[PDB]
Amino acid sequence: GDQRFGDLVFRQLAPNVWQHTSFEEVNGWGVVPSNGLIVRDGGRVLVVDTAWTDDQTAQILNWIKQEINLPVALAVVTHAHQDKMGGMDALHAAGIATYANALSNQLAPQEGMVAAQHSLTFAANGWVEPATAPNFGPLKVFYPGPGHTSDNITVGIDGTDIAFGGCLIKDSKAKSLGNLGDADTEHYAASARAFGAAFPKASMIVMSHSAPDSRAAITHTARMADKL
Ligand SMILES: [Zn+2]
Numbered sequence: 001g002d003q004r005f006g007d008l009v010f011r012q013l014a015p016n017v018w019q020h021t022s023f024e025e026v027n028g029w030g031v032v033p034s035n036g037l038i039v040r041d042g043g044r045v046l047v048v049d050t051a052w053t054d055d056q057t058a059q060i061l062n063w064i065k066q067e068i069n070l071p072v073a074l075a076v077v078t079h080a081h082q083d084k085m086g087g088m089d090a091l092h093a094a095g096i097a098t099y100a101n102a103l104s105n106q107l108a109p110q111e112g113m114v115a116a117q118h119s120l121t122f123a124a125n126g127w128v129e130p131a132t133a134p135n136f137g138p139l140k141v142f143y144p145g146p147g148h149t150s151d152n153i154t155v156g157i158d159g160t161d162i163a164f165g166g167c168l169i170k171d172s173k174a175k176s177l178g179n180l181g182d183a184d185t186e187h188y189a190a191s192a193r194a195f196g197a198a199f200p201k202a203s204m205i206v207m208s209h210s211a212p213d214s215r216a217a218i219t220h221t222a223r224m225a226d227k228l
């Protein structure tokens with residue numbers, strides 16, 4: 001079921017999980033949807049990724065205030081690209097603590113993005129170091145390796161059958177991995193598979209530019225990456 005607030009679209013995926021969608025015209029691609037998540041965790045709300053712009057991100061915050069009416073404690077952004085970090089200033093103006101891979105924060109200035117306030121670091125097995133992600137509630141953050149970008153991270157939602165692949169994962173019907181300009185073509189397949197292995201039971205795979213899919217999205221993405 002889809003709900004609308006301004007230029008955004010919201011779809012409920014689980015009793016306490018919603019997908020947020022914002023659009024931007026991208027040369028050679030079209031009017032591209034970018035998806036993120038909204039998670040209600042007891043008396044607070046957690047956000048995964050911004051919208052493409054500050055104005056669109058402010059609309060996510062206003063929709064949370066209206067439909068959920070619980071304060072937004074934090075946001076995790078999954079890499080330093082406009083569709084995931086374009087709205088950082090809107091989060092900061094609202095007093096929301098922001099987190100990103102330390103590498104995302106390092107790359108953010110070069111990418112024309114505003115860095116997150118806090119940096120996440122990861123173990124050699126890809127799992128986030130818990131001292132860098134305190135009070136993340138059901139969010140389980142995993143760095144699968146370089147793929148779509150060198151800094152892309154993924155998030156699993158504990159207590160649900162959902163795992164969010166961000167821009168690393170394409171749906172099971174995709175014909176390419178899209179723009180490979182910032183991609184790691186040598187490690188993409190292994191990174192896609194590391195994401196699948198980190199959340200081995202998730203049956204609903206959420207991704208940035210397609211509607212939620214089955215685990216066939218992971219298998220297919222990795223098969224496409226094997227040809228690179
Ligand atoms: Zn990207």
Ligand SMILES: [Zn+2]
Nearest residue numbers: 083167208209
């Ligand atoms: Zn993307």
